[PDB]
Write a protein that binds this ligand. Structure first.
Ligand SMILES: COc1ccc(F)c(F)c1C(=O)c1cnc(NC2CCN(S(C)(=O)=O)CC2)nc1N
Length: 284
């Protein structure tokens, strides 16, 4: 990376440290992911307006560097700055639509993100929002990485129940959780452990059974001993979101991965009949 000048450290993940850096050859400002030591090469071709562009992939001396286009802020920071007032519905709708477009795209190419969450959604002054840090199906764990409370909050139930070969539906679930959070200004299922996460989901949506989710009782980590919670009134979940929004959210949160709405179909939902592209006011 002799052609890269580090500007400042942005953060640390479980297996990689991220830096804001400058490309001496292009003058370009980028984000660098340093991982201590093929599927990645395919990501370099997964180009979309709503996917953070992977500019370069460099493997040198037991070190793997991923060079990404730089964006100044993530959705998490923006929501916090908008906690007092709340992100205007038009903008929430625009962000949801754009991400659904991004997912419709990657899913059509058989690529799953696997770890959607506010901090993995980057935004710019142009009103765009992009999917970042796509996850694989490796490297030396960063010893100094600090635990993050939001880590499991967006995990689909099939992952928590031990599904080994989950589908693109996991991303829809995660996005649905993010949608709910933008609307209510509070995480939907803030669990701090896998079982707590599962039970928080169960408490709201009801403990799944063969009726609503065929095959759920045969899943790896399913336990007949799970407490039985009855699904609560859905109007209680994201007030004061309108029925178009609640309807879409309910379809994004279906327990059965096969019944959960696809990104492609979601784009056609009535909720987006009046979708527009507002300009957010960002403080950088
Ligand atoms: C979340 O995105 C990533 C996650 C892991 C990783 F290894 C990465 F390289 C990225 C990544 O591509 C990436 C990370 N950060 C940034 N810019 C930061 C600047 C600070 N804002 S802030 C705190 O002011 O809101 C948050 C976004 N731009 C990027 N392009």
């Amino acid at each position: 990376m002799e052609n890269f000048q580090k500007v400042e450290k942005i953060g640390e993940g479980t297996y990689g440290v991220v830096y804001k850096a400058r490309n001496k050859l292009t003058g370009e400002v980028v984000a660098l992911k340093k991982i201590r030591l093929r599927e990645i090469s395919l990501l370099k071709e997964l180009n979309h307006p709503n996917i953070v562009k992977l500019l370069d992939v460099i493997h040198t001396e037991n070190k793997l560097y991923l060079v990404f286009e730089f964006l100044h802020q993530d959705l998490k920071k923006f929501m916090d700055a908008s906690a007092l007032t709340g992100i205007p519905l038009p903008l929430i709708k625009s962000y949801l639509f754009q991400l659904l477009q991004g997912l419709a795209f990657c899913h059509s190419h058989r690529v799953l993100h696997r770890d959607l969450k506010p901090q993995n959604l980057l935004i710019n002054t142009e009103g765009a929002i992009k999917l970042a840090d796509f996850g694989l199906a490796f490297g030396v764990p960063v010893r100094t990485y600090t635990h993050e409370v939001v880590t499991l909050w967006y995990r689909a139930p099939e992952i928590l129940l031990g599904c080994k070969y989950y589908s693109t539906a996991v991303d829809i679930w995660s996005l649905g959780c993010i949608f709910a959070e933008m609307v209510t200004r509070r995480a939907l299922f803030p669990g701090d452990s896998e079982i707590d996460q599962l039970f928080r989901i169960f408490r709201t949506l009801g403990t799944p059974d063969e009726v609503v989710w065929p095959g759920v009782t045969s899943m790896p980590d399913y336990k007949p001993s799970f407490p039985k919670w009855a699904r609560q009134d859905f109007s209680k979940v994201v007030p004061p979101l309108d029925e178009d929004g609640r309807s879409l959210l309910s379809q994004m949160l279906h327990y059965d991965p096969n019944k959960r709405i696809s990104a492609k179909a979601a784009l056609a939902h009535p909720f987006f009949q009046d979708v527009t592209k507002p300009v957010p006011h960002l403080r950088l």
